[PDB]
Amino acid sequence: MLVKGNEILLKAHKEGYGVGAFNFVNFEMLNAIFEAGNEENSPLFIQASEGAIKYMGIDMAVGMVKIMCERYPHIPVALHLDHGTTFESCEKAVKAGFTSVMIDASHHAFEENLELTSKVVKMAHNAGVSVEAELGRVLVNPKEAEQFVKESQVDYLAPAIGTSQGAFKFKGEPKLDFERLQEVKRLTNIPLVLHGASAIPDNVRKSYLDAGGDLKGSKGVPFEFLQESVKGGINKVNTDTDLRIAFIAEVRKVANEDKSQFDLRKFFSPAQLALKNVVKERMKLLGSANKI
Amino acid sequence: MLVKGNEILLKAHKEGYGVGAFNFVNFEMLNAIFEAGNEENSPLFIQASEGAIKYMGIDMAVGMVKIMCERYPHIPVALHLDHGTTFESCEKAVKAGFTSVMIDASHHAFEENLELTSKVVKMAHNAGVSVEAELGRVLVNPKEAEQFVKESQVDYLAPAIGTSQGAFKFKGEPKLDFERLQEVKRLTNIPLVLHGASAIPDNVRKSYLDAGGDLKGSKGVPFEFLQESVKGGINKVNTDTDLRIAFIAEVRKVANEDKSQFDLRKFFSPAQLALKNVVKERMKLLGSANKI
Numbered sequence: 207m208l209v210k211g212n213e214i215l216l217k218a219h220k221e222g223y224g225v226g227a228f229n230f231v232n233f234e235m236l237n238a239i240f241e242a243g244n245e246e247n248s249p250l251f252i253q254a255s256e257g258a259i260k261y262m263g264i265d266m267a268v269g270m271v272k273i274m275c276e277r278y279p280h281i282p283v284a285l286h287l288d289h290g291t292t293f294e295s296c297e298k299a300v301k302a303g304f305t306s307v308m309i310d311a312s313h314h315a316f317e318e319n320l321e322l323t324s325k326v327v328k329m330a331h332n333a334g335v336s337v338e339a340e341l342g343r344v345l346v347n348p349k350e351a352e353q354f355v356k357e358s359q360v361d362y363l364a365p366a367i368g369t370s371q372g373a374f375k376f377k378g379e380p381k382l383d384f385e386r387l388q389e390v391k392r393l394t395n396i397p398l399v400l401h402g403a404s405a406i407p408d409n410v411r412k413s414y415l416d417a418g419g420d421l422k423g424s425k426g427v428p429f430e431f432l433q434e435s436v437k438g439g440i441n442k443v444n445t446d447t448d449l450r451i452a453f454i455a456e457v458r459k460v461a462n463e464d465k466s467q468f469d470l471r472k473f474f475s476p477a478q479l480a481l482k483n484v485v486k487e488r489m490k491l492l493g494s495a496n497k498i
Numbered sequence: 499m500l501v502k503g504n505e506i507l508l509k510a511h512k513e514g515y516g517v518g519a520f521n522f523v524n525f526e527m528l529n530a531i532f533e534a535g536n537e538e539n540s541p542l543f544i545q546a547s548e549g550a551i552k553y554m555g556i557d558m559a560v561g562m563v564k565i566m567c568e569r570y571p572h573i574p575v576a577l578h579l580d581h582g583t584t585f586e587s588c589e590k591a592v593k594a595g596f597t598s599v600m601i602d603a604s605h606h607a608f609e610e611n612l613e614l615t616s617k618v619v620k621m622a623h624n625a626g627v628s629v630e631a632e633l634g635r636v637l638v639n640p641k642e643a644e645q646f647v648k649e650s651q652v653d654y655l656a657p658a659i660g661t662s663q664g665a666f667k668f669k670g671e672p673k674l675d676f677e678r679l680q681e682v683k684r685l686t687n688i689p690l691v692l693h694g695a696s697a698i699p700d701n702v703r704k705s706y707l708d709a710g711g712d713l714k715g716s717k718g719v720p721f722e723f724l725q726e727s728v729k730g731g732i733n734k735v736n737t738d739t740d741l742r743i744a745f746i747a748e749v750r751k752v753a754n755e756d757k758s759q760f761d762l763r764k765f766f767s768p769a770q771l772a773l774k775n776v777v778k779e780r781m782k783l784l785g786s787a788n789k790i
């Protein structure tokens with residue numbers, strides 16, 4: 207059941223748990239994500255960045271997801287455009303079959319962000335698609351978020367509270383503005399989204415370095431911070447970097463330990479398993495396990 | 499378009515060229531194979547082994563190919579079950595949407611090979627699907643191939659004339675029994691198939707070794723032997739190993755040269771390019787280029 211994103215996140219919002227939003231760029235990532243949701247009895251947010259869409263072609267992005275949905279028809283799945291940069295990108299996703307779209311205009315001033323988001327909302331809602339937007343870069347102004355949500359009719363909001371994409375989130379100590387998060391939640395009363403929510407667990411780090419990799423003083427969000435975010439009102443947790451490190455760690459490993467290995471399945475089967483286990487543990491941490 | 503295997507190979511049979519049959523196991527391989535055919539204006543034989551089908555799941559194997567065919571509707575495409583081992587496996591491929599199936603019973607005596615092949619043919623032909631079979635392991639008996647084709651009504655035949663799967667084809671010197679090939683072709687007058695037809699070209703071996711890989715003194719079929727096979731009557735040229743070596747060569751290269759790289763596209767975009775170039779060259783070598 208491919209469903210509009212709001213169907214999944216309104217439930218998480220009402221019941222106070224978080225739904226991981228897991229990026230993919232090919233079949234091995236998608237397969238591992240679905241198997242995780244199947245084994246944890248967890249709803250799924252599947253995300254594709256504009257770059258991943260260009261890599262796969264939007265027809266294959268939607269095509270593979272729809273195939274996976276028929277394979278696991280009992281799992282609620284939303285297919286979400288991650289960090290859409292233009293109205294036209296969001297519209298193309300809508301037409302291709304995406305059930306959720308994010309328009310990121312947090313770099314514009316409030317008035318232009320609200321205007322562009324409202325335009326996307328009008329377009330997507332007319333097609334039965336949910337919309338995500340972003341406020342803050344500079345942390346979110348809770349009073350701006352209140353008006354933004356009322357004016358735009360956006361389904362969920364990503365408030366900046368101290369996170370950032372990538373493996374290098376903090377060059378000092380991890381800190382998130384939970385008081386700010388709670389204020390936004392109180393004033394907006396909608397599902398909230400956490401961007402840059404990869405944690406880089408110790409076991410995933412160990413596997414990557416044990417394979418000769420280098421994470422350049424990386425630092426992710428601690429598990430207790432993710433747990434505190436969900437308590438504060440986060441319901442969608444964007445997760446990408448964790449999946450990639452776990453995956454490539456195993457590819458590096460196979461390459462190192464057998465120089466005559468060129469069967470793709472021998473590289474990517476252990477890579478899928480490692481990615482899947484990250485997703486499974488994240489679903490348990492966030493509280494979406496056993497929610498189907 | 500997605501068409502019966504015989505539609506492609508009968509044309510190649512009557513015109514005297516070879517159509518590469520390229521194996522895939524995931525989206526990256528399929529995409530690079532398709533881009534190769536689009537750029538050479540070549541018909542495509544897309545192959546999936548039973549192992550590949552188990553890895554992808556047959557619904558995804560077919561689903562991805564149909565997406566690709568709609569992306570390049572001008573390219574004749576057959577989707578082929580490579581080395582089917584049971585009737586039931588061939589039957590599942592037929593039901594899933596394969597347009598060509600191979601039943602490999604060449605390890606049985608003639609009567610048992612003929613019986614199992616005839617059963618598959620009856621089922622596949624009833625569903626508008628073409629069938630490949632195999633004779634020889636001792637090399638093919640041409641008079642036996644004659645009666646095998648006449649009795650079974652199989653669409654194309656793989657006669658054993660010296661090749662073998664994998665990168666360890668020739669422990670000594672490459673040698674194919676072209677006289678035996680010509681006799682089979684004279685007596686059967688159908689499209690013929692060459693198994694284990696990877697060449698392991700110099701540039702691909704160079705790339706793999708430079709990436710720290712070990713090929714273990716591998717030896718493929720020389721380009722001259724492949725062209726002579728086509729002249730002798732080979733119309734379908736099974737090619738797998740060359741694609742995987744070229745692909746994994748690039749993967750190994752990205753891992754060696756940047757230990758902090760875990761973006762999957764940075765690994766597989768060059769891998770796709772290398773695989774695509776092998777295919778394009780093979781299409782030109784075999785004579786399928788510019789045949790659409």
Ligand code: NA
Pocket residue numbers: 287288289308338444
């Ligand atoms: Na997003």
Ligand code: NA
Pocket residue numbers: 579580581600630736
């Ligand atoms: Na075959």
Ligand SMILES: [Zn+2]
Pocket residue numbers: 289371401402444
């Ligand atoms: Zn983000």
Ligand SMILES: [Zn+2]
Pocket residue numbers: 310340401
């Ligand atoms: Zn963001």
Ligand SMILES: [Zn+2]
Pocket residue numbers: 581663693694736
């Ligand atoms: Zn073979």
Ligand SMILES: [Zn+2]
Pocket residue numbers: 602632693
């Ligand atoms: Zn064979």
